[PDB]
């Protein structure tokens, strides 16, 4: 019932897109911090339906490793989405280029990523753009999956549909997305998590594109793990990566079997 600025002090722009902006807002009376996605509803004709879907999906989310959705408001043709603020920023900025991060930190983060992704898959949601730039850290360095702008429901009441839409970010996309006209959602998300783990352990992406026409991807398929990034990765997490970055999605490891992996369950001294 009050103009936005009267209840909220805007502190900083967290990010911007064709969508609009994401801002850090502090409540003037409670002093609580919130991220606010701001969407100009007049940009593009598909804006109402896309934001309807995103709001619905965000209403489904309730997990400690997924950005929480507090609610939505609209002023004129401006739509606000109020979201949990993650003051630690992007997981991307914890990855030292060509180095990565200490193996116990990468294991902890990977545990939290797996918890969030398997939660999403359990309720039938696929995120479809998992990468370190979309994985945020709260003030205690707990990981949170963020930005469900590309997400959709692939399964409900044990009825699953195959996806066909080309989306994501090439270094993180699974090869079947390039090769097949239709594909299951869950192996695609598992593949992108494996790329994220590679980046955390080695500080670099293994290939620009998951294609035979990419030399580094062919090297991986030829098991040339004396090359970077694999040379930087201890053999236990590398064995996990060998099970995840499997080209054939029907032979790719699932998350239940990732939970049984030896490195995944190894206590790591910091």
């Amino acid at each position: 019932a009050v103009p936005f600025v009267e209840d909220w002090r805007l502190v900083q722009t967290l990010g911007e897109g064709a969508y609009g902006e994401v801002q850090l807002a502090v409540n003037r009376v409670t002093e609580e911090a919130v991220a606010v996605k701001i969407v100009d509803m007049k940009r593009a004709v598909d804006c109402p339906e896309n934001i309807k879907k995103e709001i619905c999906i965000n209403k489904m989310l309730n997990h400690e490793n997924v950005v929480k959705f507090y609610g939505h408001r609209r002023e004129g043709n401006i739509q606000y989405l109020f979201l949990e603020y993650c003051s630690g920023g992007e997981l991307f900025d914890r990855i030292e280029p060509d180095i990565g991060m200490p193996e116990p930190d990468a294991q902890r983060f990977f545990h939290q990523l797996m918890a969030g992704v398997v939660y999403l898959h359990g309720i039938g949601i696929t995120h479809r753009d998992i990468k370190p730039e979309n994985l945020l850290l709260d003030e205690r360095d707990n990981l949170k999956i963020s930005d469900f702008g590309l997400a959709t429901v692939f399964r409900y009441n044990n009825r699953e549909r195959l996806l066909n839409k080309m989306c994501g970010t090439l270094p993180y996309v699974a090869p079947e997305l390039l090769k097949r006209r239709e594909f299951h959602a869950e192996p695609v998300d598992v593949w992108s998590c494996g790329i994220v783990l590679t980046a955390m352990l080695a500080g670099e992406l293994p290939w620009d594109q998951p294609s035979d026409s990419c030399q580094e991807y062919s090297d991986w398929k030829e098991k040339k793990t004396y090359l970077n990034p694999w040379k930087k990765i201890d053999s236990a997490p590398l064995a996990l990566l060998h099970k995840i970055l499997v080209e054939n999605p029907s032979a790719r490891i699932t998350i239940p079997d990732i939970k049984k992996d030896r490195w995944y369950n190894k206590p790591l001294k910091k």
């Binding site: 309807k52 879907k53 619905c56 999906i57 039938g124 959709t152 429901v153 692939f154 399964r155 409900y156 009441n157 009825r159 549909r161």
Partner: peptide, 10 residues
């Protein structure tokens, strides 16, 4: 908005 149709599953 429509989970019974898997959103854009239409």
């Amino acid at each position: 908005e429509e989970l019974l149709n898997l959103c854009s599953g239409k």
